Design an enzyme around this catalytic site. Structure first.
Site, short mmCIF file in Angstrom:
data_model
loop_
_atom_site.label_atom_id
_atom_site.label_comp_id
_atom_site.label_asym_id
_atom_site.label_seq_id
_atom_site.Cartn_x
_atom_site.Cartn_y
_atom_site.Cartn_z
N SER A 162 -11.88 10.74 -3.77
CA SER A 162 -11.38 10.52 -2.38
C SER A 162 -10.00 10.37 -2.51
O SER A 162 -9.24 10.19 -3.66
CB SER A 162 -12.21 9.33 -1.95
OG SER A 162 -11.88 8.25 -2.71
N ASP A 189 -6.46 8.27 -0.46
CA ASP A 189 -6.08 7.31 0.51
C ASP A 189 -4.71 7.83 1.15
O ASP A 189 -4.07 8.24 0.74
CB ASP A 189 -5.51 5.99 -0.32
CG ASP A 189 -6.72 5.20 -0.85
OD1 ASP A 189 -7.98 5.45 -0.59
OD2 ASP A 189 -6.31 4.22 -1.44
N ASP A 233 -12.66 8.67 -8.07
CA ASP A 233 -13.68 9.72 -7.62
C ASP A 233 -13.55 10.77 -6.88
O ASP A 233 -14.54 11.39 -6.45
CB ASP A 233 -14.68 8.47 -7.02
CG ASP A 233 -14.21 8.12 -5.61
OD1 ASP A 233 -13.24 8.57 -5.13
OD2 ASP A 233 -14.64 7.27 -4.92
N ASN A 284 -9.10 5.20 3.19
CA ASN A 284 -9.56 6.05 2.26
C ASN A 284 -10.67 6.98 2.93
O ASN A 284 -11.32 6.53 3.83
CB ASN A 284 -10.53 5.07 1.24
CG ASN A 284 -11.15 5.79 0.05
OD1 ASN A 284 -11.07 6.95 -0.03
ND2 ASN A 284 -11.68 4.92 -0.89
N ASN A 303 -7.89 8.89 -5.56
CA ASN A 303 -8.59 7.78 -6.26
C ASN A 303 -9.39 8.74 -7.34
O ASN A 303 -9.53 9.92 -7.28
CB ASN A 303 -9.55 7.15 -5.30
CG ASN A 303 -8.67 6.53 -4.41
OD1 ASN A 303 -7.78 5.93 -4.37
ND2 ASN A 303 -9.13 6.50 -3.03
N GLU A 313 0.80 -1.02 0.16
CA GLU A 313 0.05 -0.08 -0.03
C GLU A 313 0.87 1.35 0.04
O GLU A 313 0.47 2.21 -0.74
CB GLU A 313 -1.04 -0.09 1.19
CG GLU A 313 -2.15 -0.90 1.23
CD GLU A 313 -3.11 -0.95 0.10
OE1 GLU A 313 -2.72 0.28 -0.69
OE2 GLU A 313 -3.96 -1.68 -0.01
CL CL Z 1 -8.89 0.62 2.71
#
Ligand code: CL
Ligand code: CL
Ligand code: CL
Ligand code: CL
Ligand code: NA
Length: 129
Positions: A50, A52, A48, A59, A46, A35
């Site tokens: 959002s 992370d 859309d 998120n 992301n 990650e």
């Molecule tokens: Cl997550």
């Protein structure tokens, strides 16, 4: 902060993630590796809108507030910036809430795609724990 592999394993174990909801420590270290490459300051937008955050790429659509994700929730009740600290407490506490919500660690697509079903113990091999 960029953790070492064993350093992060020890920090995760001290914060109660070892076998949390049945997920051995290696699962959590493997997820963090793919990650964030163990970097607490990692962020990624992301499609859309959002974002992370942190070692486990949590998120803003659901889990933290960053003030710029319309219609989102803040189910861990934290600013997303808390997820970027050198201190992993907020990330761990939020991860515990995520992994308890029903789908386990499949919430982390990279865990499903790169850690699930592999020899995750290799991620803690040799670590003084
Ligand atoms: Cl997550
Ligand atoms: Cl393990
Ligand atoms: Cl928002
Ligand atoms: Cl599960
Ligand atoms: Na949010």
């Amino acid at each position: 902060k960029v953790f070492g592999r064993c350093e992060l394993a020890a920090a995760m174990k001290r914060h109660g993630l070892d076998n949390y909801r049945g997920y051995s420590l290696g699962n959590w270290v493997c997820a963090a590796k793919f990650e964030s490459n163990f970097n607490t300051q990692a962020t990624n937008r992301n499609t859309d809108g959002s974002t992370d955050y942190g070692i486990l790429q949590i998120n803003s659509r659901w889990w933290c507030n960053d003030g710029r994700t319309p219609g989102s929730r803040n189910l861990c009740n934290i600013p997303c910036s808390a997820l970027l600290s050198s201190d992993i407490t907020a990330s761990v506490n939020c991860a515990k809430k995520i992994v308890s919500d029903g789908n386990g660690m499949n919430a982390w697509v990279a865990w499903r795609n790169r850690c699930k079903g592999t020899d995750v113990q290799a991620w803690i091999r040799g670590c003084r724990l």
